[PDB]
Amino acid sequence: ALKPEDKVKFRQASYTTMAWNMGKIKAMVVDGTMPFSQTQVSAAANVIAAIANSGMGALYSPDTLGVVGFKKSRLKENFFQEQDEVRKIATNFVEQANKLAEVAAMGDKDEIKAQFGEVGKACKACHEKFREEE
Amino acid sequence: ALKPEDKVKFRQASYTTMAWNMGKIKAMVVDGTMPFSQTQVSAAANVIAAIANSGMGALYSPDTLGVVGFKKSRLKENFFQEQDEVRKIATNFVEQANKLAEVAAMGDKDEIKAQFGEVGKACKACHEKFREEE
Ligand code: HEC
Ligand code: HEC
């Protein structure tokens, strides 16, 4: 298997990778601080959908509590008590991530904007329950 | 724009994310230390193709030399002198990553194994020239 420190590293890396690509979509379709490119918005959405489907469940085990990956894990222990809540939030995120990739393929800015907001809410929902605010 | 420390963080995260997914393909089709699942091999290949197409070129600027992202950047300065070599290696990696995703979709273990070896060589080619060995 993976050691705990690998699980933390790989999940921190995965989330950081998604944040870079979320930021590019935000810049092009929400803030307009970057010219809208279909191929780049699509490419960024595809990373988010791909990581969402990569089975990150395997990187969550109680032996990762308090472990340093890149940094000390910010996973809260309540993650392991609230499995109904974890499933609800994770399955919503996967569903929204897929939809974002589907609409970013052909969509205009308004459609992508709507789908992007649903993914952002899904990221935030998990953070609000299961990530330490520092 | 992004600060240098963000560029290093995002590129380290991106490569670490790809290494997790490479490791899963290796386990299932090379070492057989994990039972072969089509959907999981495909899901892992799709992450690699998606990150390969995410325009990581934007995360390489000379102001990132020696900068801490998660860790001190291991980018070598010769990256900025050997642009012909960078282009050759990067375009090969993108091409091999796409092919891996295409064959992992329907492929058997032998086809994926062949495509996986081409991606692994492409990762290594860039490391050999432009990443400090520590
Ligand atoms: C639970 C189902 C989550 C979903 C969906 C997303 N994130 Fe998250 N994130 C989560 C946890 C439990 C943690 C802490 C991981 C750890 O072990 O430390 C995180 C962390 C991040 C980070 C910080 C990464 C780091 O380098 O320390 C970022 C930038 C982040 N997450 C972003 C992010 C985005 C953009 C998401 C949707 C696209 C997203 N996360 C979803 C839990 C969950
Ligand atoms: C150049 C075109 C590259 C290709 C293709 C790949 N990698 Fe790489 N990698 C590269 C550099 C310049 C660096 C250092 C980045 C920095 O600023 O430190 C890396 C680093 C890695 C790492 C370490 C990440 C960390 O957390 O410090 C890993 C695990 C890694 N790279 C893996 C990897 C894999 C699996 C690739 C193909 C699928 C791959 N890299 C390609 C340059 C390049």
Residue numbers in the entry:
A (entry chain D), B (entry chain D): 2 to 135
Could you give the paper's own sentences about this structure?
This is the case of a group working with cytochromes c′. Furthermore, they pose a challenge as their heme centre is very sensitive to radiation, and thus careful data collection and analysis are crucial. Notably, because of the high-symmetry space group (P6222), a single 60° wedge gave a 2.08 Å dataset with 99.4% complete­ness, but adding the three further wedges within xia2.multiplex increased completeness to 100% and led to a significant improvement in dataset resolution. The overall RT PHCP structure showed a four-helix bundle, superimposing well with the cryo-structure having an RMSD value of 0.38 Å.
The VMXi beamline and its associated PXF within the Research Complex at Harwell offer a highly automated pipeline where researchers provide a suitable protein sample that is used for robotic crystallization, monitoring and subsequent in situ data collection from crystals in crystallization plates or in thin-film sample delivery systems. Routine RT data collection provides a useful capability that is highly relevant to studying protein dynamics and ligand binding without the complication of cryo-cooling.
